[PDB]
Amino acid sequence: VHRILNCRGTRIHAVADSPPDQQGPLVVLLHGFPESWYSWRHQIPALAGAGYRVVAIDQRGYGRSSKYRVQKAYRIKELVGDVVGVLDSYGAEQAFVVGHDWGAPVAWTFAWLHPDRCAGVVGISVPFAGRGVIGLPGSPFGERRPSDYHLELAGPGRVWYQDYFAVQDGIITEIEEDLRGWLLGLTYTVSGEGMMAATKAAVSMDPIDVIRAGPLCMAEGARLKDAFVYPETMPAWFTEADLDFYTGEFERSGFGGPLSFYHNIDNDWHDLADQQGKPLTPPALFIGGQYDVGTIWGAQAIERAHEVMPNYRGTHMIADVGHWIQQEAPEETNRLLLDFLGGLRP
Amino acid sequence: VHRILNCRGTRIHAVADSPPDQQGPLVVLLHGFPESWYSWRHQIPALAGAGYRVVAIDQRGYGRSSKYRVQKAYRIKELVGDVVGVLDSYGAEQAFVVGHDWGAPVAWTFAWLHPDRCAGVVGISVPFAGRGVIGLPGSPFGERRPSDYHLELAGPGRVWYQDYFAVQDGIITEIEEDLRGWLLGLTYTVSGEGMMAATKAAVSMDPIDVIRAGPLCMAEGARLKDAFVYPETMPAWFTEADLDFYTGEFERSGFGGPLSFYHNIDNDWHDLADQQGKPLTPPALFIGGQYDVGTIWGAQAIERAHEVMPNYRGTHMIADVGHWIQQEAPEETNRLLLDFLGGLRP
Ligand SMILES: O=C(Nc1ccccc1)Nc1ccccc1
Ligand SMILES: O=C(Nc1ccccc1)Nc1ccccc1
Numbered sequence: 001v002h003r004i005l006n007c008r009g010t011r012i013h014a015v016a017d018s019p020p021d022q023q024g025p026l027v028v029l030l031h032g033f034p035e036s037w038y039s040w041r042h043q044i045p046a047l048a049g050a051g052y053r054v055v056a057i058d059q060r061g062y063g064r065s066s067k068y069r070v071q072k073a074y075r076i077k078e079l080v081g082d083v084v085g086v087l088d089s090y091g092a093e094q095a096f097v098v099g100h101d102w103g104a105p106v107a108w109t110f111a112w113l114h115p116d117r118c119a120g121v122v123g124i125s126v127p128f129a130g131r132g133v134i135g136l137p138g139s140p141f142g143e144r145r146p147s148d149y150h151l152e153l154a155g156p157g158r159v160w161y162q163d164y165f166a167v168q169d170g171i172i173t174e175i176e177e178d179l180r181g182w183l184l185g186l187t188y189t190v191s192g193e194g195m196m197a198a199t200k201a202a203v204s205m206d207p208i209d210v211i212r213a214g215p216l217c218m219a220e221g222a223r224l225k226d227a228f229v230y231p232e233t234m235p236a237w238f239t240e241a242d243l244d245f246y247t248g249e250f251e252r253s254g255f256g257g258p259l260s261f262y263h264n265i266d267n268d269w270h271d272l273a274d275q276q277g278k279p280l281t282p283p284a285l286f287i288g289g290q291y292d293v294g295t296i297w298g299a300q301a302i303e304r305a306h307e308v309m310p311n312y313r314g315t316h317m318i319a320d321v322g323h324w325i326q327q328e329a330p331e332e333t334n335r336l337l338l339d340f341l342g343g344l345r346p
Numbered sequence: 347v348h349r350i351l352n353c354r355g356t357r358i359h360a361v362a363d364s365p366p367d368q369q370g371p372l373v374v375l376l377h378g379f380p381e382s383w384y385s386w387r388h389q390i391p392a393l394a395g396a397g398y399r400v401v402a403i404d405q406r407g408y409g410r411s412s413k414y415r416v417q418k419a420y421r422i423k424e425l426v427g428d429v430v431g432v433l434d435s436y437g438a439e440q441a442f443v444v445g446h447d448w449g450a451p452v453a454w455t456f457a458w459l460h461p462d463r464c465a466g467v468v469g470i471s472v473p474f475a476g477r478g479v480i481g482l483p484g485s486p487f488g489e490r491r492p493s494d495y496h497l498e499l500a501g502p503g504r505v506w507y508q509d510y511f512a513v514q515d516g517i518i519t520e521i522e523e524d525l526r527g528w529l530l531g532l533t534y535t536v537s538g539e540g541m542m543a544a545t546k547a548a549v550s551m552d553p554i555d556v557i558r559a560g561p562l563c564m565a566e567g568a569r570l571k572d573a574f575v576y577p578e579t580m581p582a583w584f585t586e587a588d589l590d591f592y593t594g595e596f597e598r599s600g601f602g603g604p605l606s607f608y609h610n611i612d613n614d615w616h617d618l619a620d621q622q623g624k625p626l627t628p629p630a631l632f633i634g635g636q637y638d639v640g641t642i643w644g645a646q647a648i649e650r651a652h653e654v655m656p657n658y659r660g661t662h663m664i665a666d667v668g669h670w671i672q673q674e675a676p677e678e679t680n681r682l683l684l685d686f687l688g689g690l691r692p
Contacts, residue, residue: 009523011597066522067600069415069514168415176412177355251357252598254413 003055004064007085013037013064014086017044018053025119025346026092028083029056032101032125033258034183036063036249038242039100042330043337050338052096055086059103061257063249074260076133076268079106080113087117096341100124100326101294102261105133105268111282112275120283120344122337124325125294127286127301128309131272133265134294135301137208141308142272146265154212161216161224165262172255174223180247185228187238189215192322194229195291211297237328284309285340287333289321313340349401350410353431359383359410360432363390364399371465371692372438374429375402378447378471379604380529382409382595384588385446388676389683396684398442401432405449407603409595420606422479422614425452426459433463442687446470446672447640448607451479451614457628458621466629466690468683470671471640473632473647474655477618479611480640481647483554487654488618492611500558507562507570511608518601520569526593531574533584535561538668540575541637557643583674630655631686633679635667659686 005012015037018024027047029040037056047054058065060082061074068074083106087095096119099107104126111121129135132142139149150160165171175182188194198215211217215227234240286305288295295302295317306312316336321328351358361383364370373393375386383402393400404411406428407420414420429452433441442465445453450472457467475481478488485495496506511517521528534540544561557563561573580586632651634641641648641663652658662682667674 006524009519011522011525013597064597066525066597067518067602068522069518069600069602069605172413172415173355176357176414178352179357179412249598251359251410251412252595253600254415254603256413256415256602257600259415 005086005089007088010060010082010085011066012057012060012082012086014055014057015044016053016055017048019048019051022053024051024053025341026087026090026095027052027054027341028086028095028097029054030059030083030097030099030103030107031056031062032099032103033261034186034246034250034255035101036246038245038249039324039327043326043334046334046338050342052341053090055090057082057086059106061260062253067253067257069256071260071263074257075264075271076105076109077113077271079261080110083107083110084114084117093117094119094346096120096122096344096346098122098124098337101126101323105129108280109272111284112278112280115281118282119346120285120340121280122285122287122340124287124333125289125292125323127288127295127298127305128280128284129298129301130308131269131276133268135298137211137297137300140298140301140304142269146269155217157220158212159218159220161218162262162265164218164224165259166265168256168259168263171224171259174225175255179251180243182225183246183250184243185225185230187324188231188235189227189229190293190323191235191238192289192291192320192328193235194231195322196320198229207296207299216293238324280309281311283311283313283344285313285316285336287316287318287325287336289323289325289328290317290319291322292325293323351432351435353434356406356428356431357412358403358406358428358432360401360403361390362399362401363394365394365397368399370397370399371687372433372436372441373398373400373687374432374441374443375400376405376429376443376445376449376453377402377408378445378449379607380532380592380596380601381447382592384591384595385670385673389672389680392680392684396688398687399436401436403428403432405452407606408599413599413603415602417606417609420603421610421617422451422455423459423617425607426456429453429456430460430463439463440465440692442466442468442690442692444468444470444683447472447669451475454626455618457630458624458626461627464628465692466631466686467626468631468633468686470633470679471635471638471669473634473641473644473651474626474630475644475647476654477615477622479614481644483557483643483646486644486647486650488615492615501563503566504558505564505566507564508608508611510564510570511605512611514602514605514609517570517605520571521601525597526589528571529592529596530589531571531576533670534577534581535573535575536639536669537581537584538635538637538666538674539581540577541668542666544575553642553645562639584670626655627657629657629659629690631659631662631682633662633664633671633682635669635671635674636663636665637668638671639669
């Protein structure tokens, strides 16, 4: 089940499974921030049980995969290259690729640049946003420069969490003081029950400024950790044991690699300009969450899905769940994936 | 036995042991590059058995301890601060501190700056080199600037491995292509049997240029890995299981943190100028290895040991062993430590 791949110089660790005959359409699962192959624990057995060869990797910088320090190692095309390397290790011509959160842009771009290797693509939480990487209330497909739109048009004397993440200084310092607690905080805050709670504190007007006054919109000089909300008890879907696993992965891997993903957003935006316009042709699908910030911020990109993906197979919304979609609604997510993959030809 | 310390914002993981009454002089073991608390596996039980509270940590950037990205987190005083934090967690006023390789300058500097917290200090492989951090054939106590002496006076069109390590680009890339193999290579090359082998290839003249034409002296553009020597079989002291452990630690931690230690050598040299001259007063001891590059390069600093450490208790040389001293000669190392600590007052 545990595999160590390294087709072209980069070590990629993974957890695989499939029918005993080890035959069936290859399905690659790409996790987001700050997660791991473990975020797909509820999907792996279902996918393998339906007859698919499922491969859940640790992206570079995460878990047991190669940890690079230089910023250029975390640019979008490199991430996409790793996926290509995964298929070449299994000797697969085509593959179904599913990505959640940061894994999404990587899955989307993989489909964008390598349609000949993609039997279909599914993005979760973060909808296809072209050179933009992640669609926002103002820029669904990276119309304006990422960092620019952040600074101006997001807060007077405040700071966009992504720019903070990119600095890789204060952010890591705040995490290291108490990493287990930080994960718990972040996880709960953007989770369904966490978001519905914050809302329950009522006391509807312009989404563009809803991001502001939001948990991820901090005041220059403060700590993101300062806006976290902690549960009195561990949610039913995210148990103590799960938290110990993630904590274990990150106090060993650190957040340097993961955060570098963010550091390159602008760079990615630039690297993908030569693709702007061209459509994404493999069969595509998007799974969103009612209270997921990703789904929300990407509303406009979603509305214009069919415009850029001529073979879009639909937008699916999972009610009463937040950001950690495949973890917050594993069975519903499984049904959706299984339906998508089942109606397709490997 | 496994402990998670965090007295002041930095997570430090460790493996501890002691008599059941959990009482006795505190002994802190500091590992080097690229090692872990595991490098002291043969010492922990002996020290605990003799009645000492032994604590073997993972320095920052290693194993399960906090992984910082910024360069300033890996400067000498920060490393030393972590040690201080270790004693405060056990509430110990004084402690015996043993350091091998990179752990040595940290143990030495700890004694240098905090004599009031040090019952005694032991450096292994790397002898006390003042603001120099690591003594060299030319500069035993950091007489000339570290990087300067490297460039000029070390190779025409060649490059000093430490400067390469500091760049943190090519070095990591070469490692990631095959990390398990890299560790095996590095470990064997500078090991006793590896060094005696290279020498057996005879075919004595100026040590200053012996470093050159050496394995750690590479030609600009080449890979350090290019000069490695691999054993036909695993040495008796460094087994497959040990290698799997180290491999496991590093493909999770990466080398970014460890390498940053090197990146700050010059900076350290600068940070410790305000200490130049002042003597190191706690009871000190040095353990060297006949074929250890550390012991060899630090020959001059060794000859002048009593000059800077008025309470030096002696230089000890372990024959027929290379760089990995406490691993290559665990029992001999244990006897030496036990003798040193036994004749002292906690
Ligand atoms: O910001 C997040 N993701 C992201 C993915 C691709 C491009 C840019 C950003 N995730 C996130 C997840 C949980 C809490 C906060 C943010
Ligand atoms: O270079 C090494 N150590 C060191 C420690 C303190 C300051 C500067 C350098 N170790 C080393 C160990 C094995 C192989 C090669 C180098």
